[PDB]
Amino acid sequence: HMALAAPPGELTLALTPDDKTLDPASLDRALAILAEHGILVLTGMLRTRLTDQLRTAMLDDLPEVLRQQDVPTNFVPGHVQQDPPVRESLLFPDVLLNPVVYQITHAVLGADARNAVYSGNMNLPGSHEQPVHLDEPHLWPGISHPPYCLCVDVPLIDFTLENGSTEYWPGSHVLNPDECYDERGCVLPAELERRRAVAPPVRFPIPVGSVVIRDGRLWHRGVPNLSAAPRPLLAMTHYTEWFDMPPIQLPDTVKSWVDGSDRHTHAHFVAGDVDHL
Amino acid sequence: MALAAPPGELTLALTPDDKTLDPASLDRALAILAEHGILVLTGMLRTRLTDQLRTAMLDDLPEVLRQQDVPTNFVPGHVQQDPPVRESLLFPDVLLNPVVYQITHAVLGADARNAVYSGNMNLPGSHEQPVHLDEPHLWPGISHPPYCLCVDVPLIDFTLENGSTEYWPGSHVLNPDECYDERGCVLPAELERRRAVAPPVRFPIPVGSVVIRDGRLWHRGVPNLSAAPRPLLAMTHYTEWFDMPPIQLPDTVKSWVDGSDRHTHAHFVAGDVDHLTGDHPF
Ligand code: NI
Ligand code: NI
C-alpha cells in the first residue's frame, strides 16, 4: 500500500463549517472525484463541539458494549460494530442532514436518495487486519452499473497511519468481473493482486471535522489500531429510493425536523428512548 | 400487428403436469425473455384454478364499482382489482408456480421474491391506454439487466376483441434520455422511432396461459369490445434488493408460503385481509 502524510489533493475538497453549499465548479470536481476515484475527502466540515460530544458519548458507551456476551465484530478482532446514541441531545442536523453531503448525494443518487444507516465502528487498540471488501455489493454479477449508494464516514478523532486510518482502493468501485466477491463481500485474492499492479491502495491521515463520501462498492479494509486509544467512526449511507433497507430507529422527539426535510431519511420514529446498543 | 395465436417465437407450449423445464427448454425460455422481453407459456394452469379465480373476481366487481373513486389504470374501463387472499382461493400452483420460479430464479437469482398479488378488470367499452412500462429503469439513460418480471395470468380466453394486451417486443432494454414521463408513459417521438424498427404485436392468449415479461416492457391495455369483463391476475417477481411493500396474506397460508424456496415478500395477518381496500387494522 501507499502510506501518505495527508489526504491526497486529487481526492480532497477543503471546506469550513460555514460552507452550506458547494459552488458549481466545486460540486463538478466533487462528482468527478466520486465518479473516477469512488472516494472524496471533505476536510473542515464539522465544528469540534459536535465531534467532541459524539466522541465522548461513544467512548462512554464502549464499556457497556464490551460487557456483552458476544461483542459484534466486523470480520476480525478489534473492529467493533457500535451504534452512536440516538438521544435528541446527540442528533445534530449538521451530521444527519448535512447540506453539503446531501448536495453531493442528490446530484449522484437523485433528489429521492435517503440516509438508511446511522451506525459506527470502534477500532480498538491491538485490532487485526480486515480482509479487503466492499460494504455494499454490485446489483448483478459481471455487470457495470452506476452507483446506488454513498457511504458517509465521520471520523470522531484524528485518523493516523498508527491508529487505524482505513485502507482505500481508489477506482475499485467500478470493478465487477465474474467470481470477484464471496458471500461476505470480500474481494478474491487473484483480483486484489491484478488491481494492485495497476492502482495500489492508499492509507492517509484524516483530521477530525472531515467527512469521507465514497461509493458503497469501493474496496477497503480496516487496519490495526497500534495506539492506546479506541478510534471511533460514525457511519451513514445514502441509497437510491428503490434500494431495500430497514429504517433507522429514531426518537419521535426529532420527527419534526427529520420528517419535514427534503434531505430524506429512511426512519422509524419510536415513542421514548431507542436502545442503540 | 394482429395475430391469430401466440407467435411461436414468444411461446413455450406446456401442460399443467410440467413441474420443471429440461435444460434446452429453460435455455429457450431465457433466450426469449432476454431478446423479446415477453414469454408466453400456454397450458400451465388447470381450468379448476382459473374457473375459481375468474368467478371470485367477477363476484367482487360490484364491491369495486361501488367505491367513491373507482381506481382506474390511465383511462376508463381498466379497473385495478386485487384478487381475494382467502385460503380457499390461494393456490400454490398460482402463487408458487414451479416453472415460473425456475425462470425467475434463473433471471433474478434464488433470492428473487413475488411482491405483487393484484389484477386488472378490463370492462366492456373500455378506452385505449397510452403505451407505458409497469416498472421503470433504475437510472435514466443507462442500460442494465432486469430486476423484475411481471407474471400475468389471464382468467378467461384473451382475444383481439376482448382486450388482449398490446406488447412491444424488445422494448424492455430501451432507456434513452427523456423517453418516459412521471407515469411511465413512453414519449410519442420514442414510440414512433421504435415502431419503425420493431412494431408492437397483439394476439389471443388461451386461459391456462402464464405470460412472463420484463417489468420494463412497453405495452398498453386496449378496448374490450366483448359483452363480458376480461379479468387478469397480476404478480411481479423482484430482485431481493428492490424495495416493495409486502403482500398482506392470512396467517392460515403462512405454513406453505413462508416455508418455500419460492420467496414471497409477505406480511401474515391474524384475521381475514380486506383485499379490495387494505383497511385491516395492523
Ligand atoms: Ni468495511
Ligand atoms: Ni400496464
Count of CB atoms situated within 10 Å of the CB of A3: 11
Alpha carbons B275 and B269: distance in angstroms, whole number: 12
Alpha carbons B275 and A51: distance in angstroms, whole number: 50
Alpha carbons B6 and B203: distance in angstroms, whole number: 6
Count of CB atoms situated within 10 Å of the CB of A141: 14
Residue with cell 457497556: A64
Alpha carbons A259 and B120: distance in angstroms, whole number: 35
Alpha carbons A220 and A130: distance in angstroms, whole number: 9
Alpha carbons B23 and B29: distance in angstroms, whole number: 10
Q: What is the largest CA-CA distance in chain A?
A: 53
- The angstrom resolution of this structure is 2.0
Coil, helix or strand for B144?
Answer: coil
Q: Which residues of chain A have a CB within 8 Å of the CB of B242? A: 242-244
User: Helix (H) and strand (E) counts for chain A?
Assistant: 6, 14
Characterize the bridge pairing of strands B210-214 and A202-203: unpaired
Instruction: Show the cell assigned to A31.
Output: 462528482
Rg (CA), chain A: 18
Distances (CA, A) of B115 to A23, B118, B136, B151, B236: 43, 10, 16, 11, 6
Distance of CA A177 to the CA centre of its chain: 24
Residue with cell 389504470: B73
CB-count exposure of residue A274 (10 Å: 0-12, 13-18, 19+): middle
- Whether the CB of B76 is below 8 Å from some CB of chain A: the reply is no
- Whether the CB of B142 is below 8 Å from some CB of chain A: the reply is yes
Q: Which residue in A108, A112, A114, A140 has the most chain B C-beta atoms within 10 A of its own C-beta, making it the best mutation to test that interface? A: A140
Residue with cell 458519548: A57
| Nearest partner of B194 among B168, B217, B215, B219, judged by Cα | B168
Distances (CA, A) of A125 to A44, A55, A79, A141, A151: 26, 16, 10, 37, 24
Coil, helix or strand for A101?
Answer: helix
Q: What share of chain A is helix, strand, coil (3-state, %, to 5)?
A: 25, 25, 50
Distance of CA B180 to the CA centre of its chain: 20
Q: For residues A15 and A29, is the Cβ–Cβ distance under 8 A?
A: no
- Nearest-ligand number for the alpha carbon of A131: 1
The DSSP output letter for A273 is -
Coil, helix or strand for B273?
Answer: coil
Buried b (16+ CB within 10 A) or exposed e, B14-44: beeebeebeeeebeebeebbbebbbbbbbbb
- Nearest-ligand number for the alpha carbon of A217: 1
Q: Which residue in A139, A239, A240 has the most chain B C-beta atoms within 10 A of its own C-beta, making it the best mutation to test that interface? A: A139
Alpha carbons B14 and A269: distance in angstroms, whole number: 50
Alpha carbons B233 and B231: distance in angstroms, whole number: 7
Q: B9 Cβ partners below 8 Å, 6+ apart? A: B32, B36
Amino acid at the residue A71: V
Residue with cell 408513459: B185
| Nearest partner of A276 among A42, A6, A83, A26, judged by Cα | A83
- Nearest-ligand number for the alpha carbon of B168: 2
| Nearest partner of A150 among A112, A187, A101, A184, judged by Cα | A101
- Centroid of ligand 2 to alpha carbon of B61 (angstroms): 20
> For B13, what's the count of Cα atoms within 13 Å in the CB-facing half-sphere?
4
Listed in order, strand segments (DSSP E) in A141-230 are 149-155, 167-168, 202-203, 211-215, 220-221
- Whether the CB of A146 is below 8 Å from some CB of chain B: the reply is yes
| Nearest partner of B238 among B246, B250, B227, judged by Cα | B246
Please give all residues whose CB falls under 5 A of ion ligand 1, grouped by chain where several chains appear.
Answer: A 135
| Nearest partner of A211 among A262, A144, A252, A156, judged by Cα | A156
Q: Which residues of chain A have a CB within 8 Å of the CB of B265? A: none
Is B242 in contact with A241 (Cβ distance < 8 A)? no
Phi, psi of A6 (to 5 degrees): -155, 165
Alpha carbons B277 and A64: distance in angstroms, whole number: 47
Across the A:B interface, residue pairs with CB atoms under 8 Å apart total 29
Q: Name the residue among A143, A240, A243 with its Cβ closest to that of B145.
A: A143
Alpha carbons B240 and B113: distance in angstroms, whole number: 6
Q: A87 Cβ partners below 8 Å, 6+ apart? A: A251, A273
Alpha carbons B28 and B32: distance in angstroms, whole number: 6
Q: What angle do CA A216, A221, A222 make, to 5 degrees?
A: 115
Amino acid at the residue B30: L
Is A242 in contact with B145 (Cβ distance < 8 A)? no
Q: B233 Cβ partners below 8 Å, 6+ apart? A: B53, B57, B83, B94, B117, B118, B119, B152, B153, B155
Is B145 in contact with A148 (Cβ distance < 8 A)? no
- Centroid of ligand 2 to alpha carbon of B184 (angstroms): 9
Helices within chain B (DSSP H only):
23-36, 47-65, 92-95, 98-108, 188-195, 254-259
Coil, helix or strand for B257?
Answer: helix
Count of CB atoms situated within 10 Å of the CB of B256: 12
Q: For residues A150 and A105, is the Cβ–Cβ distance under 8 A?
A: yes
Alpha carbons A48 and A117: distance in angstroms, whole number: 23
- Whether the CB of B138 is below 8 Å from some CB of chain A: the reply is yes
Q: List the domains of chain B with CATH numbers.
A: 8-269 (2.60.120.620)
Find the closest chain A residue to B146 by CA distance: A140
Characterize the bridge pairing of strands A167-168 and A220-221: antiparallel
Phi, psi of B238 (to 5 degrees): -125, 155
Instruction: Show the cell assigned to B277.
Output: 381496500
Instruction: Show the cell assigned to A28.
Output: 463538478
Q: B94 Cβ partners below 8 Å, 6+ apart? A: B45, B49, B53, B153, B233
Q: For residues A43 and A7, is the Cβ–Cβ distance under 8 A?
A: yes
Amino acid at the residue B86: R
- Centroid of ligand 2 to alpha carbon of B255 (angstroms): 32
